Structure 1
């Protein structure tokens, strides 16, 4: 999987980025069985003031986690993996759950390349 993680600049020190990528990655391997090195976490920073909720401009505390997964996971599984990302990122970032969004997009495995190799 590839987890696109959208945060504001300077809300996560370099040591907290690592804790959030670690939390996300572990949650994914512990609940799905996909090996460690197959989970990419790509942080996308933006300046404070680039997030809007109901047309209202936010500060720096929002995190949107967008996971791009292979298809074929029960709804039960994907829900557990979402809740666990919310909780684990919440601690690993020192941020309340309310500031944490999690979306999953699914793809056929045969159009999914990691390390230059197909799944």
Structure 2
């Protein structure tokens, strides 16, 4: 996956960012069975005042998570994952759930590239990693915490 996490400038310290990325990644691997290192968390910070809710300028406490996934998972599984991300990001970022928005977009695996490689179908990550070249797998493996 690629999770675009849209937050206000400095609402998450370097270390808060690490735990938010940790929670998003662990929720993904735990619920989909995809390797930790396939989860990309991409923080987009902006100055406070760039978020408007119903036309009202907002402070620095809103969080939008835009997830980009492969097609192939069920509406049930996707709802569990969206609810776990709301839950865990809440505890990692110490933010009320009322502040958290989470959208999942889906694309065919055949038009999705991670680490310069095309992704397999959901659940086939096992064989697909074994097929990767030896220093491809190595580079991916250096991104697990």
- Answer yes or no: same fold by TM over 0.5: yes
User: After the TM superposition, which parts of structure 1 deviate over 2 Å for at least 4 consecutive aligned residues?
Assistant: none
Structure 1: gaps (5+ residues):
none
Equivalent-residue separation in structure 2 for 1:35 and 1:11 (angstroms):
28
Superposed displacement of residue 72, structure 1: 1.0
Number of the residue aligned with 1:95: 95
Equivalent-residue separation in structure 2 for 1:6 and 1:87 (angstroms):
17
Report the secondary structure of 1:110's partner residue.
helix
Q: How many residues align?
A: 119
TM-score under structure 2 normalisation?
0.82
Equivalent-residue separation in structure 2 for 1:33 and 1:84 (angstroms):
15
Number of the residue aligned with 1:45: 45
Equivalent-residue separation in structure 1 for 2:104 and 2:19 (angstroms):
21
Superposed displacement of residue 78, structure 1: 0.3
Higher gyration radius (CA): 2
Residue correspondence of structure 1 range 19-98 to structure 2 within 5 A: 19-98=19-98
Superposed displacement of residue 21, structure 1: 0.2
TM-score under structure 1 normalisation?
0.99
What do the CA deviations read for 1:62-114 (whole angstroms, capped 9, x no partner)?
00000000001100000000000000000000100000000000000000001
Equivalent-residue separation in structure 2 for 1:76 and 1:66 (angstroms):
18
Equivalent-residue separation in structure 1 for 2:75 and 2:30 (angstroms):
17
CA RMSD of aligned residues (A): 0.4
